[PDB]
Every structure is written in C-alpha cells, then in structure tokens.
C-alpha cells in the first residue's frame, strides 16, 4: 500500500533516463520506501504478526537485491547505499 | 517505573523503588511550607496514645489546596516534584497575576498546560466543573461531596472514583474500598485519574528502611510480659484464648461503625 | 478530500441549545479546509424502539467533504456532550448540495 | 523449481506413447534438438519440427508402424547430480545389444557405436531400445 503519487518522489531521483523502474537501483529504493513506512506503522501498536511478516518479506527481498546489485557492480551498489540508510 | 537493586552486598537484591525520569526537583515554596513537627505517640495529656512509633529522619509538610476558590482565572502548571506527605506527588501552579499554589497531581506527568474552573470547563485534566454536566460512566477524580470539607476521596497514588448513575439533582459514585455513595450532581469534580500508581509495588528489602521513617519494631502480645499485654509471654507457642486489643477487648469480625448520620448517603456497603 | 454525511441525534427537549454546538463543529471543518454542502435539518422524528427512555430525536446533517486525518479528533466531539448524542459519520457515498 | 531441461524431456515421450499419441511436444533447447537429430538418424522417430517466436517449441513424431509401438525402451541414465561416465570399452550394450545408448563426448552428441568407433568415451545422456 504505497501510492503512485509517493512513487513519483522515488522514481524521479533514483531513475536516470525513464522508464528505469524495473532496475535494481530503483526497486531497492521502492522496497526501502515500503520498509521504512511499514516500520512505523508500529509504535503505537505491535501485536500484528501479518504486517510484521510483510515487513520481513520486503526486507528479505531488499537484502537479496542489494547482494545481487553488489554482485553486478560494486560502484553502483556503494553509490546507492549512501542515498538509502545502511550500516549506519 | 520500578527498578531493582543489584546484589553488591547481602540482602540488597530485594530493594525495589519507584523512579520517574520526568519528575522534577528543587526547593519548596516557603508560603505553602511548614515544619509540622514529629508527634511520636508521646502524649501532652499523659501516657502514650499510639504504638509502633519512634525516631525517624526530618520531614516537612507542603500545603496542598482542595478548596479551588479562584474561579474564571487561567492557571499554568510550572513543575511536578516528589512529595514527602502523599504518594500521588504534588504539582506547582502559577496563576495569571502571580499567585502560586500546590495541587494534587493530574495524570500526564507534564507541565505547561493552562487550567480553569467554573460551571463549564475544558475536557482536559486539572479543569474543574459540576458532575451534572457529564453523561456518567467515567472517572471523576477528587470530588467536592461536602462543600464544607473541600475535594474528598482519591488522594493517594493511582486512586480513582467511578461515576455510575444519575437522575435529576443526584448522582452515584463507586470507590475502590468497596463502598458506593450518592451525592448532589452540582458537586465539583476535576475528572480523570491520579498519577504515579506505582507506590504499592515498592519492596523495602532492608530492616532499617522503615526505621528512617520512624516505624518502631512490632513485639507480639503473646511474647511480652503477662501484665504488659492481655495475651502475655509463653507458655511457648500456645496463644491460649481468643484475640483481643492491648486494652483487653475482643475485636475480630466485630463491626465498629456507630456514625448513623451518613449511612443514608451509602447505597452499597463495604463488605 | 473525503466524504462524510455527519448526522446528529439532537435531544428532542434540549434543541434550544444546539446553535452553540453547531458553530463549534463547523469551525473544525472550515479550519481543516473542508467544504460544507448542506448543513440542514430533517426535524423531529420518531425512533424504532425506546432508548435511554427517549422515543424521538431531532435530525441534522452536514455533508463536509473533509480531510481524512481529522476523523479521530472529530468523532469524539459529539460523544460526551449529552445534548447532541448518537451521531453517525456515514463515510464516502458523495454529497447532496443545499437540499433538506 | 526447474533445474534440468532433460528432467521433463523423456517423461512426455514415455507417457504420450502410453496415451497412444502420434506426436509429442516440448520446450526447445540445444541438447533436445541434438538428441532428436540422432534419434531420427537411428530411426527411433519419424521426423521433428521446431517453431516459436515467443518460445521455441519442438514436436517429434512417434512410430507405431501398423499399431504396435516401435520404441520398446525409453530411458535416461545419468543425471547432473550423479553423472555416469563410460570409457572406450566400458561403453554399454543396451538391452544386451537390442538397443543403443547416446553420449555427449568432446566431439558432440553421438551413439555408443560412434564413440567406440572414434575409440573414445564420455558422459551418458540417453538409453533406448
């Protein structure tokens, strides 16, 4: 549950020539935008294992797509994880 | 919150105290402070009046208001501090022209909100109005049940009063004692609950922890000398006769209410 | 902005107070940049069976086209007033303009 | 899910022949069209045809002559997890010489005959009669 109007602030910055939205650099950003939204969501409230598993599904796909991007090009990986919060 | 001590030395592991990271501190407001003096059960007219009292470290009394007489003036909460006289903690209030008062703490542990009183006042904590205003089934806080005694009931940590029913000029209130009472609907109430509510969770852990509060050790009537209590020293582990007061009279299960003047206001009695 | 009809059950013997409540409820819609479509009465009507000893209610409805974020701070304003009672907000389903 | 393009190749043929079907169709691959070319040369099938712009699909025709199925054994032997490799005199005599085997080799897909004639061995891919 993320609008076409909220994606319009992600595909604008993480794109390059349009349409780029199928690419790993943009899908890792669209997953991060859903993860960081469904992180809170929680607090207030906790007791919902369904949306908690949804969050962990989106994280599971992001972990893999990050590892995959790093396995294609390390420079395109490092130039993404300065624009999205990772490893503090 | 409540927190438990580490085993640094013997028995200390049992110690549990109430702690609040937002609770303020400072100096008491002198025009609402008195030293109040120790009473010690030792008697101005003769022999002792009370038992299990001796010593205890210096304390003073902070004067709290239950009259709420300054109507139609907004007042602001300035700070909430630890109180030595009631477990609810007590807040400092500043009125719009310069007057400062101590009040029973509303819930939220916070300062900076402004409060009023009248016949109609805002739904927020610390604002006061008559119980005839509200649809019942809620918490009323400290209640002016008798005008000539101020705001009564629910003064200790986490204490509450439920308003159950209404008709015409009257309403009914139910208490955590087991008693239920009837009052005029025009009686003033502040609505909501008292804060803290953790005071009953405290564990002293140490045999000196009530000594610094003046609490003297309890010696058994069946252990002290036979003339000094009606039970009397053993005759080891054989209590003998029915339990009595130090004054020689039976007490267990025997009801002692003799008031007769307020029973017509009590609609359900404490068991 | 999101549709809500907001229909009140005003007390059948206390409707003499109601303009002061209305002027405080409309304020919460105008402040929020909403759009009032009717703010009109159906008048005094009968109920289906007697509740809280009453068998009548006085009906008034707003149609507000309001921001969705206001609902949980609006449905509480006619919940403890005891002269404007038993309100239904009736979400979505558009709005009729200016009619009874 | 799907790991081996050959693990759904010969089942179609063994099950379609049991259903008495004259043609059997599969998704196409380099090894599938390499096996089909040798199975036509050795006469185990009549013909094969391959077509598709979206996905290329391969259809081969089964022999029944006048009613009775002409291929009397259709087996795989070897799998990618546990492969079978035979040396120049360890090459098999399928159905005690009534059938044949197919091998991949360094010279490309051929019969156990063509491999033994080439004085070489290799990896097994099919067993037939």
């Amino acid at each position: 549950s993320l609008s076409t109007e909220a994606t319009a602030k992600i595909v604008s910055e993480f794109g390059r020539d349009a349409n780029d939205t199928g690419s790993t650099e943009v899908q890792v950003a669209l997953l991060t935008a859903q993860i960081n939204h469904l992180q809170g969501h929680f607090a207030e409230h906790k007791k919902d294992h369904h949306s908690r598993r949804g969050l962990l599904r989106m994280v599971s796909q992001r972990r893999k797509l990050l590892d995959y991007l790093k396995r294609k090009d390390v420079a395109r990986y490092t130039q993404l994880i300065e624009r999205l919060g990772l490893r503090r | 919150a409540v927190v438990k001590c580490k085993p640094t030395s013997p028995g200390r592991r049992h110690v549990v105290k109430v702690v609040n990271p937002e609770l303020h501190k400072g100096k008491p407001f002198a025009p609402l402070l008195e030293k109040n003096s120790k009473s010690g059960g030792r008697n101005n007219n003769g022999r002792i009046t009370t038992r299990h009292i001796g010593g205890g470290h210096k304390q003073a009394y902070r004067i709290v208001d239950f009259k709420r007489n300054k109507d139609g003036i907004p007042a602001v909460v300035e700070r909430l501090e630890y109180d030595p006289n009631r477990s609810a903690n007590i807040a400092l209030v500043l009125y719009k022209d310069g007057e400062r008062r101590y009040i029973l703490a509303p819930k939220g542990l916070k300062a900076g909100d402004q409060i009023q009183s009248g016949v109609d006042a805002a739904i927020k904590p610390g604002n006061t109005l008559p119980m005839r205003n509200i649809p019942v089934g809620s918490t009323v806080h400290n209640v002016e049940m008798k005008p000539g005694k101020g705001g009564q009931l629910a003064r200790s940590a986490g204490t509450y009063v439920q308003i159950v029913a209404r008709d015409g000029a009257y309403v009914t209130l139910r208490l955590r004692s087991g008693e239920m009472r009837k009052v005029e609907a025009d009686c003033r109430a502040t609505l909501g609950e008292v804060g803290n509510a953790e005071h009953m969770l405290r564990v002293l852990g140490k045999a000196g922890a009530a000594r610094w509060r003046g609490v003297r050790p309890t010696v058994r009537g069946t252990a002290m000398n036979p003339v000094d209590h009606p039970h009397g020293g053993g005759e080891g582990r054989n209590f003998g006769k029915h339990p009595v007061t130090p004054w020689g009279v039976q007490t267990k299960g025997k009801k002692t209410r003799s008031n007769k003047r307020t029973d017509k206001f009590i609609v359900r009695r404490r068991s | 902005m999101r549709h809500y009809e907001i229909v009140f059950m005003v007390h059948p013997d206390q409707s003499e107070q109601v303009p002061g409540m209305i002027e405080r409820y409309t304020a919460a819609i105008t402040g929020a940049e909403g759009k009032i479509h009717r703010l009109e009465d159906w008048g005094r009507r009968q109920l289906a069976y007697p509740i809280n000893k009453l068998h009548k209610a006085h009906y008034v409805l707003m149609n507000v086209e309001a921001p969705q974020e206001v609902i949980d701070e609006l449905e509480t304003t006619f919940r403890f007033n005891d002269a404007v009672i038993r309100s239904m907000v009736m979400r979505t389903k558009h709005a009729v303009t200016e009619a009874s | 899910s799907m790991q081996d393009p050959i693990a759904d190749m010969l089942t179609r043929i063994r099950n379609g022949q049991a259903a008495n079907k004259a043609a059997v169709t599969m998704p196409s691959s380099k090894l599938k069209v390499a096996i089909a070319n040798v199975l036509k040369e050795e006469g185990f099938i009549e013909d094969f045809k391959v077509e598709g712009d979206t996905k290329p699909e391969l259809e081969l025709t089964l022999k029944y002559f006048q009613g009775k199925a002409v291929v009397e054994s259709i087996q795989r032997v070897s799998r990618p997890g546990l492969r079978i490799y035979k040396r120049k005199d360890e090459l098999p005599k399928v159905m005690a010489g009534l059938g044949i085997a197919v091998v991949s080799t360094s010279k490309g897909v051929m019969t156990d005959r063509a491999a033994r004639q080439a004085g070489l061995g290799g990896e097994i891919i099919c067993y037939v009669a």
Binding site: - | - | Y49, R86, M88 | -
Partner: protein, 55 residues
C-alpha cells in the same frame, strides 16, 4: 444492497413472531436472505429497526 433504510418496505419481510420471512416464501434467491439479514443489521445499528421483540 438497495433501499434498506425504508421500514415500510422492510416490514413485509419480518414476522409478528419476532423472526424473518423465509426465502422460500418470498420466492427469492439465497443471497437475498443475506441482503435482508444485512438490511436488518444495518437498520438496527441506525435506529430504524428494533434489535428484539416480545411485548
């Protein structure tokens, strides 16, 4: 699903015994009895219909 706030219509589908008229009797499809039960529940929680019967 439609016109469920009209009680002059709804009272043709509920009994003096304080119950519901069967879909066998109205000649209606099974999901009309669901539409009717939803109309009854949506009239109850709107002060249009009573929740219970008896004198």
């Amino acid at each position: 699903e439609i016109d469920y706030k009209d009680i002059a219509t709804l009272k043709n589908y509920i009994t003096e015994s304080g119950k519901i008229v069967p879909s066998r009797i109205t000649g209606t499809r099974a999901k009309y009895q669901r539409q009717l039960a939803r109309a009854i529940k949506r009239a109850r929680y709107l002060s249009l219909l009573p929740y219970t019967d008896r004198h």
